[PDB]
Design a protein around this ligand. Structure first.
Ligand SMILES: Cc1ccc2[nH]c(=O)c(CN(CCO)C(=O)Nc3ccccc3F)cc2c1
Ligand SMILES: Cc1ccc2[nH]c(=O)c(CN(CCO)C(=O)Nc3ccccc3F)cc2c1
Lengths: 603, 603
């Protein structure tokens, strides 16, 4: 369906992200049989909502819970919403959630990171109080988008196992909200920006009205009409542009309007006039070679898990600003739009990624049998339905983010095993579909290291080569000398094989804050510096390398294991955002370069 | 003035705590002169708002900034607030704030932990947007509630000095909002709940209205009318009840109804049926010998400072609950109301405290530079204005929390130096006025240790004896063997002198998380455990001691100094809420007792 971020013009939001809701588990899964959405959640406890439910209660049982949980709260409908289209919207409900407005089911959704909404007008009376019950499921299987395997022992007690690194946090991670629109209302927009060697060109507009005549107009930062248009679906505006630039991110405003014989609708969409294209080994932005620096990030912090927070966001962007990072990838799932809005406004360049991580049965900490399917691409494991769900995930992401200028490329997935035979058969259609859905952005699929230049089967189907490389860590452990020979050899292989622009989208080493060593070995702050330093020497020798995104700006939680010391420690910053010495290393290299430009080969 | 916690039926809130305001510093203090509230803040940046401005940007020059900062924001006013009361309310603006609606100065407030509000109807138009500018000041001087001394050096820059331990966080710490009201509006309510010997008794209701007849109806949790009152002036509803007990905390809902011939105003007030008093050497909640357990706390956390957070609140309470804490103190300032709303609902007992802290001038080892007034109570320093401002502080807090059943006691001040001359003539009037503001709750002043039995001039004026003691820490450094003698010798010296209930409001020791020592010495977890043990042993032998609160629940930030290792480390939990070995020690002692019941000497 159509998706537009709610703003407040003839429209209005009652946030209802207002924190406190009632909360209780369903350990027996009799919540639907007993119709819990019909009565006050019995035996419930307070919970904060935008957030993960796992960490809020310092309870291991609640944290490791698999299955259904229930949220609930009563809210008032603004009396002034008398005759309006009243919509209930969840910016995210991790993995699955079903919604009842007082014994009337309105929604159902299967993906944890994108919004779903429903017209609740016929089920809400303006000025009264309603009972909103959400049932949330945090289970993964071979058709869910991060694939997964829910294991159930002889006792019936379920247990979630997955193939990605980060912890499987669940719950309502983002805002829920009631919002208003007139019965004639803009409900879908699509803007393509074009540019021709930086003096003028056009923005195609494509508008889906909920039954109205649409007019449109483009406004400066100082709010003046620089262009104007009429008609529905089709338009091309022409300009003398202030281009959206990685540095500043100048934004115009396209004000879309929907007119009945009786009702108006005004929707302002921030627009960034910029071109994103690949030419050979280069990633051109506004027809200029751009060099990515920054992080693979995560949505993760103490207490709130993947729950959104404005302070966290403000702080992290201050940090990424200080350190000199010009980019990042929404590591492994669509991030909260607030992030993309920030990126739009501050000129931050983003690699937007689906939640499609886990395709791989070969990332294992060995020697626990842990029978996984023997065929990755097979009816048991990654099958036709999976491909659909995957396709669906791509659709829902693009539908949401197609208009963000900050997004400079789509990432279909992260580290699938591309060796097995069905790999190319599974991904080819997804690469073609993605291009259909958005023709205006280069496409990528993040590559795991054991599917190297000689064994990978998929990378030619994409535009930019995004590599996850750990030479000197998981392999050639603690050996910088040989890791460097391999890294550079593998990069040159990829260069000559595909002649695409290479971005190292992951490189980093677990590092204990405060672990110092004269011998500069693996888990020490000094090693993290020596490692990163070595990678950088290599990158500056390889012309096709067009980007470097360190594996993790900050330590994050993972599933328990012998590889993970209370989580992943590849953070440049700790989880409470305190900088390891590598932070200062990067700030020198990144602030030291000419902005958005690859280093001549040496200082 | 009149303060009511906004709730939602004939009233509606659009929370302006939509994080992301415009923010800037005014290092030239020329914003007021240049009328910054008239246009958009130039040289601004996004800031999340609830929460301190200090830490959001990982910047020292902003963290330590003293002077004025500016918050700005725009907000559409709801169409449905057609001809209604529109009230702009800030739950807190640390220290000072001046507010402008577009160009209209609508507000001004000194005090940082209590709300203020005003009617903005004439300056706002429903259906339109309005610009909101807030000038926030963090400066502290002698006539301020947290007293202090700002020193402008030869250069044009200010540098704040103060006398309390915790860091001087500032900014908009709590919810800000627009909330609506009919023109006939309840604007004040006061409730006193008398009980006697636990079979039955009534509640006086007394309230102020904007011209409306009041239908006062008391309700079950089940919404059944268990009593009814009549008349805009008060009542006595004498029925047999369900007591608000510390264990579970039952709650009645007294609905207050104001009426005009044209408009009707409904307001639900949470009412906890309980009595509180001092009887000899006992604290009697519902006529029961109680025993306080818990912490002295602080509004403090990573990144956000003293800014409120639902997750943080949900988690901390999960901890206190788990560890066995049945009570705590709003240490050194009025906390956000949510904390008390939560305490009411969960039967959490709460010693409410004013921001009166810093009244003392001998409070450290200063190696550093002379002049700091000579006479604490003197026109130089703590004087007429300062007793006024102090009174004003007692007023506002009580005007807000007089109806919170969790509040079982008022704390006038913290660690005042009561040896100088004016000490007794200063606190006597305030001690008198407080009871005159609320005679339903006992009152205390938290005592510093160098005012001890033979030297404190001011304890007799209060009902309960609250003592901060570090006998094994600041003095008798690391000698549990003598620290015991002194402590008991001291406690028994207090008992015989005043014959009041004794609560140790502060007892704890700095402890580096992860510092272990076979020698069980200072700043080691082992020591912290041994120290707290030693105290418990002494409490267990003084029949007068009715309450124990460990020093801080969690490590927090302080001003820079030799005694503060990256902040006060006296937390039982670290700042990110990870427990020190003392947590499990307290766990066993606290949950191990009978609820609200002192051990039988020993145990
Ligand atoms: C050349 C080669 C061959 C085999 C490999 N196998 C691996 O597992 C990994 C680690 N992998 C990171 C991959 O980039 C990870 O994320 N691991 C993980 C997570 C949860 C449980 C157990 C786990 F090992 C690297 C790897 C490299
Ligand atoms: C018997 C005696 C005599 C003199 C003393 N002087 C002190 O300072 C303290 C410490 N005090 C806690 C009081 O309970 C504190 O809060 N200190 C502080 C804070 C910031 C900077 C420097 C600082 F010393 C105790 C104390 C005891």
């Amino acid at each position: 369906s159509h998706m537009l971020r709610p703003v407040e013009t003839p429209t209005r939001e009652i946030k209802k992200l207002d924190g406190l809701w009632a909360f209780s588990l369903d350990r027996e899964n009799c919540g639907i049989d007993q119709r819990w959405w019909e009565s006050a959640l019995q035996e419930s406890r307070a919970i904060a909502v935008p957030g993960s439910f796992n960490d809020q209660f310092a309870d291991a049982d609640i944290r490791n819970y698999a299955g259904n949980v229930w949220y609930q709260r009563e809210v008032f409908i603004p009396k002034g919403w008398a005759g309006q289209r009243i919509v209930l919207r969840f910016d995210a409900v991790t993995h699955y959630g079903k919604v009842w407005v007082n014994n009337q089911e309105v929604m159902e959704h299967q993906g944890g990171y994108t919004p779903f909404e429903a017209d609740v007008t016929p089920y809400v009376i303006a000025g009264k109080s309603v009972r909103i019950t959400v049932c949330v499921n945090n289970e993964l299987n071979w058709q869910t988008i991060p694939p997964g395997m829910v294991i159930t022992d002889e006792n019936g007690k379920k247990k979630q196992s997955y193939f990605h690194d980060f912890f499987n946090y669940a719950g309502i991670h983002r805002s829920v909200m009631l919002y208003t629109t007139p019965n004639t209302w803009v409900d879908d927009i699509t803007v393509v920006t074009h540019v021709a060697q930086d003096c003028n060109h056009a923005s195609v507009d494509w508008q889906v009205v909920a039954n109205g005549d649409v007019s449109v107009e483009l406004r400066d930062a100082d709010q003046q009409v620089v262009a104007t248009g009429q008609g529905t679906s089709g338009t091309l505006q022409v300009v003398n542009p202030h281009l959206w630039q990685p540095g500043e991110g100048y934004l115009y405003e396209l004000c879309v309007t929907a007119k009945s014989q009786t009702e108006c609708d005004i929707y302002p969409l921030r627009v960034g006039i910029r071109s994103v294209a690949v030419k050979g080994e280069q990633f051109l932005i506004n027809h200029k070679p751009f060099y990515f620096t920054g992080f693979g990030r995560h949505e993760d912090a103490d207490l709130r898990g993947k729950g959104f927070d404005n302070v966290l966001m403000v702080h992290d962007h201050a940090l990424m600003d200080w350190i000199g990072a010009n980019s990042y990838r929404t590591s492994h799932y669509p991030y909260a739009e607030e992030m993309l809005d920030w990126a739009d406004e501050h000129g931050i360049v983003v690699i937007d990624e689906t939640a499609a991580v886990g395709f791989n049965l070969s990332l294992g900490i060995g020697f626990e049998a842990g029978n996984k399917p023997k065929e990755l691409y097979s009816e048991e494991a990654v099958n036709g339905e999976t491909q659909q769900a995957h396709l669906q995930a791509i659709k829902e992401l693009i539908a949401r983010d197609k208009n963000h200028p900050s997004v400079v490329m789509w990432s279909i997935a992260n580290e699938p095993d591309t060796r097995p035979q069905g790999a190319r058969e599974y991904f080819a259609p997804l690469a073609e579909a993605t291009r259909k859905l958005d023709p205006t952005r280069p496409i990528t699929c993040v590559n795991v290291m054991f599917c190297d230049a000689h064994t990978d089967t998929i990378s030619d189907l994409f535009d930019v080569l995004c590599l996850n490389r750990y030479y000197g860590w998981y392999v050639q452990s603690g050996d910088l000398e040989t890791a460097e020979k391999v890294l550079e050899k593998e990069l040159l292989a990829w260069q000559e094989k595909l002649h695409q622009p290479i971005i190292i989208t992951e490189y980093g080493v677990d590092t204990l804050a405060g672990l110092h060593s004269m011998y500069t070995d693996m888990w020490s702050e000094e090693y993290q510096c020596a490692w990163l330093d070595m990678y950088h020497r290599v990158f500056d020798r390889v012309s096709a390398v067009v980007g470097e995104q360190v594996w993790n700006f900050a330590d994050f939680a993972t599933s328990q294991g012998i590889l993970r010391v209370g989580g992943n420690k590849k953070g440049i910053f700790t989880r409470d955002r305190k900088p390891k010495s590598a932070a200062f290393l990067l700030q020198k290299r990144w602030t030291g370069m000419n902005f958005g430009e690859k280093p001549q080969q040496g200082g």
